[PDB]
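Exercise 7. Given the components listed, write out the predicted structure of the assembled complex. Treat all entries as one system.
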Amino acid sequence: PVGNLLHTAPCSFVVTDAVEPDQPIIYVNTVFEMVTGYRAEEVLGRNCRFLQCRGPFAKRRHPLVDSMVVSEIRKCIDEGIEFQGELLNFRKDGSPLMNRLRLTPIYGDDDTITHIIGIQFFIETDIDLG
Amino acid sequence: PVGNLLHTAPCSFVVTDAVEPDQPIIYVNTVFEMVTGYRAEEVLGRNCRFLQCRGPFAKRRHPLVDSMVVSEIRKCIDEGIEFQGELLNFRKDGSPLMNRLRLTPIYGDDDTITHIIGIQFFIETDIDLG
Ligand SMILES: Cc1cc2nc3c(=O)[nH]c(=O)nc-3n(C[C@H](O)[C@H](O)[C@H](O)COP(=O)(O)O)c2cc1C
Ligand SMILES: Cc1cc2nc3c(=O)[nH]c(=O)nc-3n(C[C@H](O)[C@H](O)[C@H](O)COP(=O)(O)O)c2cc1C
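Answer.
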């Protein structure tokens, strides 16, 4: 009873297209797939904010994610700068995760931001959701 | 007493320009800087292979780096796919690290690959070096 171990440190990557509108996800590693429960077909082409919604079925972002941080992310993207912050997020199966997220934008060959990398650190949280 | 901790999990990664010749480094995160000993300005614009020479002065790759694995890396970068292996690397203070390495190419708005994401997982190793 000691198996199916990971061979590398679990790091969670997601990359988006900064040219096409609204930063669609173009890649996710299988650690994101493993922690959030979302396989990659489900999320490819969508925008990450679906993580702020509790469950695949939830229509609206959950009350409890700090709308002030969500706005910092927005501000940071629109200025093409790094973002660093913590916010609530939800697995497919509803579980809550505090996500320490870092967003670094990547430049293309014309002094323009063509992609954005997001590194997720998903911490378990005992938050009460009601 | 305990402090100076880091707030996220230590994930090491770099991004290279896949358009410009020979995959120059355009981004390193600070985990890379902190595990390898090389600072961002020392490595920006250079190719990652300096990690296979032992130290910042050696200009030739170290004998015990597996020439076969380096070759497979070359094949995958060329074939436009993902590499996934383990490869002897060296900190700038000379110490050996088994670098469990993953290369993941990223397509631009185009059908061409414009960037590669490299995720290092450095491991301590008592490999005898002479
Ligand atoms: C590369 C990248 C990764 C992101 N990852 C997450 C994430 O993991 N969790 C999250 O809640 N938001 C993430 N976001 C941000 C959301 O898309 C965010 O809500 C949006 O960028 C700004 O807020 P808005 O939808 O209200 O405009 C990410 C953004 C980018 C560009
Ligand atoms: C994005 C990226 C990251 C890389 N990171 C490393 C690394 O950490 N250690 C290493 O030995 N090689 C790394 N490499 C491999 C070298 O840069 C190079 O592609 C490889 O050594 C094969 O080419 P060469 O035989 O011309 O040296 C990386 C390559 C890329 C594209």
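Discussion: Residues A 14, 16, 23, 47-49, 51-52, 70, 73-74, 77, 87, 89, 99, 101, 103, 116-118, 120 surround flavin mononucleotide (ligand 1) (CB under 6 Å). The beta strands of chain A are 12-17, 25-28, 83-90, 96-107, 113-124.
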